[PDB]
Amino acid sequence: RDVLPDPIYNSKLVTRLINKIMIDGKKSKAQKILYTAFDIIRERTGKDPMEVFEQALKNVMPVLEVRARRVGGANYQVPVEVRPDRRVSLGLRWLVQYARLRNEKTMEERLANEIMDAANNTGAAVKKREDTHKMAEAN
């Protein structure tokens, strides 16, 4: 299993993200959003958006997770090391989940900001990675 590199950034990560952003099969729209988001980031951070983005990813990606693990004949909610490909998925999912919930009028604005915030280690997605590491710690 593999994905295709986005035209513009030639990035698979970007493809994986245009995926979670996708709604109703309107890919052109989910693409316009992510690229316009990436431009909002550029003009506002004056940085390469891919740089902000990986930073955000780096801060939102869980390393520990708590999952069911039937043992004996019972189910024990347990703390497990998330895997490379899972961290990226969760990260991208969390970045796109909360961004959806934000308040900017626009989803490119909403996606841009959630990514910028997360690049600065704040916002809902980073929180999600925190609670998450929280529970995995406790258990």
Swiss-Prot record:
Assembly: Part of the 30S ribosomal subunit. Contacts proteins S9 and S11.
Any one GO molecular function term: structural constituent of ribosome
GO biological process: translation
Gene Ontology terms: cellular component: small ribosomal subunit
Function recorded in the entry: One of the primary rRNA binding proteins, it binds directly to 16S rRNA where it nucleates assembly of the head domain of the 30S subunit. Is located at the subunit interface close to the decoding center, probably blocks exit of the E-site tRNA.
Protein name, UniProt field: Small ribosomal subunit protein uS7
Gene3D superfamilies: Ribosomal protein S7 domain
Family: Belongs to the universal ribosomal protein uS7 family.
Alphabetically ordered keywords of this record: Ribonucleoprotein, Ribosomal protein, RNA-binding, rRNA-binding, tRNA-binding
Keyword RNA-binding applies: yes
PANTHER family, A to Z: RIBOSOMAL PROTEIN S7
CDD domains registered for this protein in UniProt: uS7_Bacteria
NCBIfam families, sorted: rpsG_bact (TIGR01029)
Lineage of the organism: Bacteria, Bacillati, Bacillota, Bacilli, Bacillales
Pfam family, one: Ribosomal_S7
TM spans (from-to): none
